[PDB]
Design an enzyme around this catalytic site. Structure first.
Site, short mmCIF file in Angstrom:
data_model
loop_
_atom_site.label_atom_id
_atom_site.label_comp_id
_atom_site.label_asym_id
_atom_site.label_seq_id
_atom_site.Cartn_x
_atom_site.Cartn_y
_atom_site.Cartn_z
N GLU A 120 -5.07 -11.40 -1.79
CA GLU A 120 -5.81 -11.42 -0.51
C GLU A 120 -7.47 -11.33 -0.84
OE1 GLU A 120 -4.88 -8.22 2.00
OE2 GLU A 120 -2.79 -7.96 1.55
N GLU A 172 0.79 -1.21 -0.13
CA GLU A 172 0.11 0.04 0.02
C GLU A 172 0.84 1.35 0.07
OE1 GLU A 172 -2.71 -0.58 3.20
OE2 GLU A 172 -3.68 -2.21 2.38
O1 LIG Z 1 -6.16 -5.43 16.59
C1 LIG Z 1 -5.45 -5.77 15.52
C2 LIG Z 1 -6.41 -6.01 14.37
O2 LIG Z 1 -6.67 -4.81 13.75
C3 LIG Z 1 -5.49 -6.72 13.16
O3 LIG Z 1 -6.28 -7.04 12.01
C4 LIG Z 1 -5.72 -7.48 10.87
C5 LIG Z 1 -5.37 -6.30 10.06
O4 LIG Z 1 -4.78 -6.48 8.89
C6 LIG Z 1 -5.45 -7.46 8.14
O5 LIG Z 1 -4.99 -7.88 6.75
C7 LIG Z 1 -4.68 -6.71 6.05
C8 LIG Z 1 -6.09 -6.31 5.32
O6 LIG Z 1 -5.74 -5.44 4.23
C9 LIG Z 1 -4.78 -5.60 3.34
O7 LIG Z 1 -4.69 -4.38 2.40
C10 LIG Z 1 -3.40 -5.68 4.05
O8 LIG Z 1 -2.63 -6.02 3.12
C11 LIG Z 1 -3.50 -7.10 5.08
O9 LIG Z 1 -2.43 -7.36 5.55
C12 LIG Z 1 -5.78 -9.01 8.74
O10 LIG Z 1 -6.67 -9.54 8.14
C13 LIG Z 1 -6.29 -8.56 10.01
O11 LIG Z 1 -6.70 -9.75 11.02
O12 LIG Z 1 -4.86 -8.10 13.75
C14 LIG Z 1 -4.01 -7.68 14.91
C15 LIG Z 1 -4.76 -7.07 15.94
O13 LIG Z 1 -3.75 -6.73 17.03
O1 LIG Z 2 -6.45 -0.30 5.61
C1 LIG Z 2 -6.89 -0.84 4.07
C2 LIG Z 2 -8.50 -0.36 4.15
O2 LIG Z 2 -8.56 0.83 4.02
C3 LIG Z 2 -8.95 -0.98 2.64
O3 LIG Z 2 -10.26 -0.93 2.45
C4 LIG Z 2 -10.70 -0.53 1.04
C5 LIG Z 2 -10.81 1.27 1.21
O4 LIG Z 2 -11.34 1.63 -0.08
C6 LIG Z 2 -12.71 1.23 -0.49
O5 LIG Z 2 -12.94 1.64 -1.61
C7 LIG Z 2 -12.40 -0.47 -0.70
O6 LIG Z 2 -13.56 -0.97 -0.77
C8 LIG Z 2 -11.87 -1.00 0.84
O7 LIG Z 2 -11.83 -2.45 0.70
O8 LIG Z 2 -8.74 -2.51 2.47
C9 LIG Z 2 -7.48 -2.83 2.67
C10 LIG Z 2 -6.78 -2.56 4.06
O9 LIG Z 2 -5.48 -2.69 4.14
#
Ligand SMILES: O[C@@H]1[C@@H](O)[C@H](O[C@@H]2CO[C@@H](O[C@@H]3CO[C@@H](O)[C@H](O)[C@H]3O)[C@H](O)[C@H]2O)OC[C@H]1O
Ligand SMILES: O[C@@H]1[C@@H](O)[C@H](O[C@@H]2CO[C@@H](O)[C@H](O)[C@H]2O)OC[C@H]1O
Ligand SMILES: [Cl-]
Ligand SMILES: [Cl-]
Ligand code: NA
Ligand code: NA
Ligand code: NA
Ligand SMILES: [Zn+2]
Length: 371
Positions: free
Chosen positions: A257, A151
């Site tokens: 993902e 990101e």
């Molecule tokens: O409290 C904490 C939680 O918020 C945390 O949740 C994880 C957050 O990251 C998630 O994975 C991301 C989703 O968005 C994508 O763009 C990223 O590349 C991913 O890494 C994950 O699924 C959640 O479990 O977990 C830890 C807690 O302490």
């Molecule tokens: O933290 C990130 C989130 O902000 C992200 O969520 C996306 C935000 O833009 C929207 O238009 C999408 O629908 C939504 O999924 O997802 C990835 C996470 O790492």
């Protein structure tokens, strides 16, 4: 199309073995859950850590490396012939604060003295190299795919103005890839991972950035498309356009993902899995059918498709499943409808092809077949 146990269903990875690998994001405790273990061995041939390989999990304090949890996933992958993806070396979230504090323990972002700022940049870049160096030196022979940066491009088409960029500028990205290549060698594949890679102006900005980095000799092998999508967006046409333009740059593409939310954005979720109408599962299945047909049509440009989870009983989308309630205390899912209160992240999403009871969903049948 029976709702049979997924443990007795045709293997998903096998159905797609010549097109791309099929992966799942996992947490170590799942390796101690019989059902999850059986699912990984049966349907998947690629694995990624949902959380334990992120910066804050690996080096919570400078000098304190915790590879214990990550090792469990690597050991499981090796015992089961699964490819491994490393998620992730650099990100602005789930990253320890100590990275961005100066020699006096003050936020580097708050430094005004130019001289002092250049010093902090080089300091941060050094910490970055050491973080990357230690991880890659340990796993270079076991992990083939790496989300080197996650990101780093904003949704406004600009570079994400996170502490990494504010302090070190575009160089943190260049250093990250170079350090990964330097310590891991020519055999590991390096990726830039992001979400909404199909949306402009982000898509073209990401496109221009990698084009520029590659031209500068920065080692980047592919693009990771997080693919946290909905039933109706992005359109398959835009997904295709996206994959094609990055492929045109000589980049591999991985769907990293994948989850197909039952909701829109922001989500107005149902409070429980059982409250989700059966029609939503049919709509979801038609989407999965179109989605995988496209992935196959583009198989020469996609090496992996990983789901951000194993089955519906566990998905990070639940943290985003806000439940809206009207004045009468009734659930509100209509995006443009009145409501009085919201219970954030208390609902339930159902994004996968495998149900919470480990039985196949309509979506499984839609992608396991040959139609
Ligand atoms: O409290 C904490 C939680 O918020 C945390 O949740 C994880 C957050 O990251 C998630 O994975 C991301 C989703 O968005 C994508 O763009 C990223 O590349 C991913 O890494 C994950 O699924 C959640 O479990 O977990 C830890 C807690 O302490
Ligand atoms: O933290 C990130 C989130 O902000 C992200 O969520 C996306 C935000 O833009 C929207 O238009 C999408 O629908 C939504 O999924 O997802 C990835 C996470 O790492
Ligand atoms: Cl989660
Ligand atoms: Cl069910
Ligand atoms: Na149920
Ligand atoms: Na999780
Ligand atoms: Na199909
Ligand atoms: Zn069921």
């Amino acid at each position: 199309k029976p709702h049979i146990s997924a443990l007795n269903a045709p293997q998903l990875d096998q159905r797609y073995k010549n097109e791309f690998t099929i992966g799942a994001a996992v947490e170590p405790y799942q390796l101690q859950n019989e059902k999850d273990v059986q699912m990984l061995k049966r349907h998947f041939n690629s694995i990624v850590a949902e959380n334990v390989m992120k910066p804050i999990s690996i080096q919570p304090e400078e000098g304190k490396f915790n590879f214990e949890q990550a090792d469990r996933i690597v050991k499981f992958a090796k015992a089961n012939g699964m490819d491994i993806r490393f998620h992730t070396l650099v990100w602005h979230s789930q990253v320890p604060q100590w990275f961005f504090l100066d020699k006096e323990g003050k936020p580097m972002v708050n430094e005004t003295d130019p001289v002092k700022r250049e010093q902090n940049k080089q300091l941060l870049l050094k910490r970055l190299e050491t973080h990357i160096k230690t991880i890659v030196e340990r796993y270079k022979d076991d992990i083939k795919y790496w989300d080197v940066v996650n990101e780093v491009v904003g949704d406004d088409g600009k570079l994400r103005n996170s502490p990494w960029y504010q302090i070190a500028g575009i160089d943190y990205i260049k250093v990250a890839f170079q350090a990964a290549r330097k310590y891991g060698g020519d055999n590991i594949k390096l990726y830039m991972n992001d979400y909404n890679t199909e949306v402009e102006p982000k898509r073209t900005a990401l496109y221009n950035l990698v084009k520029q980095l590659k031209e500068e000799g920065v080692p980047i092998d592919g693009i990771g498309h997080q693919s946290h999508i909905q039933i109706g967006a992005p359109s398959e046409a835009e997904i295709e356009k996206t994959i094609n333009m990055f492929a045109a740059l000589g980049l591999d593409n991985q769907i990293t993902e994948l989850d197909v939310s039952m909701y829109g954005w922001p989500p107005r979720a149902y409070p429980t899995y059982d409250a989700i109408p059966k029609q939503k599962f049919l709509d979801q299945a038609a989407r999965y059918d179109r989605l995988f047909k496209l992935y196959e049509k583009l198989s020469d440009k996609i090496s992996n498709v990983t789901f951000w989870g194993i089955a519906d009983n566990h998905t990070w989308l639940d943290s985003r499943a806000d439940v809206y309630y009207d004045a009468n205390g009734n659930v509100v899912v209509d995006p443009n409808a009145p409501y009085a209160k919201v219970e954030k992240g208390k609902g339930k999403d159902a994004p996968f092809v495998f149900g919470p009871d480990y039985k196949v969903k309509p979506a499984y049948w839609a992608i396991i077949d040959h139609k």
